[PDB]
Amino acid sequence: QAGFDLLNDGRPETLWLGIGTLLMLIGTFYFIARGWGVTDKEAREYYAITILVPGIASAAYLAMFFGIGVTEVELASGTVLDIYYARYADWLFTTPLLLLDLALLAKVDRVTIGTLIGVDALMIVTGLIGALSKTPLARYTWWLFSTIAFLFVLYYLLTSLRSAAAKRSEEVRSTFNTLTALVAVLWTAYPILWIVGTEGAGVVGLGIETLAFMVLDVTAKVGFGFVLLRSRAILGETEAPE
Template identity: 35%
Template sequence: MIVDPTALVKASSSVAPIPTVIPGPENVYQKAGDVGNRTLWVVCVIMALSSIAFYAMAFRVPVQKRLFHILTAFITTFAFLSYFAMATGDGIAYNQVKVVEQNKHVPDIVHYVYRQVYYARYIDWSLTTPLLLLDLALLAGLSGANILVAIIADIIMILTGMFAAFGSHDGQKWGWYAFGCIAYLVVVYQLAFNGRAAAAGKDGKTKAFFGAIAGFTLILWTIYPIIWGVADGARVASVDAEIISYAVLDVLAKPVFGFWLLFTHDSMASTSPSVEGFWAHGFGGEGQGTIRVGDDDEGA
């Protein structure tokens, strides 16, 4: 049998070039399992019961003394709504990250990792952390200017954290993360320095209490970005581990914080802030709506 050499040339020329990138394994989906979903429901119930308790505690004191109670009850109420949303499958999105495995002698391998991002959590934090800061600021007697700076820095911190969670590449993700850390340092400065200076003018018990509860809060808040770094950031921790870690912190930072604040506040009835004016009496009522300390002693 005689083979035409020109036919071999034509056949070989029809072979497509070897691709420089070849598909890799199937896409990876990182999502919550049964443990994570049960954790969401447990925290949802804890937030609901805590909210009911805080509202009940508010009705036990005069309206002038309810400021801390109402703020704290709102914190756990927003947290309850957030955890209910996450537990029922709402407030969740997937962030896609392209993973390229580079090789020297063979084409690169490409696959995609899709991880659940609970954006409801960031909505929760953007509402609850300013209220929590307001609790601490009013306890210390922080000025209005410093309160505004702390709250704005806090909101920037939460929003940049959410943008980082949805970042499509490392430069974008860790850039947003760095902005959030800078904003957090501003919050720390307002509480640790300006807050402590303002509390120095209070009575000894209030000063000591502010130092303890503010320190407790800042320690917890410092752990949040660490968890973010190993979860949404580096994606080393599983989604279940992320949920459990944030759940523990949220319970400590909201219900535990709230019960500690309100029980101590109620035990200092004679020196706790009293809000008159519009808060207590509406328009045309008594007072100018200012926060006054020691009203019970003045009226005695």
């Protein structure tokens, strides 16, 4: 179980990376060609934010595709791992923007949003330190650490944002809850795949692992986007409470 070695360099996962790259690209331009003539100031804002997501994911995927986005991490026993660090560079900007989109739709104050980006980014960096960790003690401490943060993100997402989004139209609250649910479950798959992936225990090959992340990423990016830029809630209405 691996895929295809598309660059004659012993990395059959490049098949999933390539497809991943291709999919983020068409999304970036689907969204761009889709909002190109949108005059609504609220929506064009959602479009801009959402277009950059697959946009930056595309660079990370292309990077990993070529091999530039991956690095060899020697463990404490001399055992080498191929860590695709670029994912974190990706996530450092993508996840915050995704949150941003949820925060705009919910009409939350700048403090909540700031808390959101800060805790989320703390999560990504610490997740990256875990990835480059040489000792298992450290690799797992960072995991729980990054996870505590994610726990905080989900919390404020499932309370502050949700209740704030309930003060708006049913059309709006509807769309918010059907991205927050998507977020909740889709995002959660990430830490699991990591601790069971090659960065953790390792009962899942890098191939399947690279396949999972592609599916998870595309769906969290493009799938989220399609749904979001397709709703009517983004068309007008500027609330304020919570």
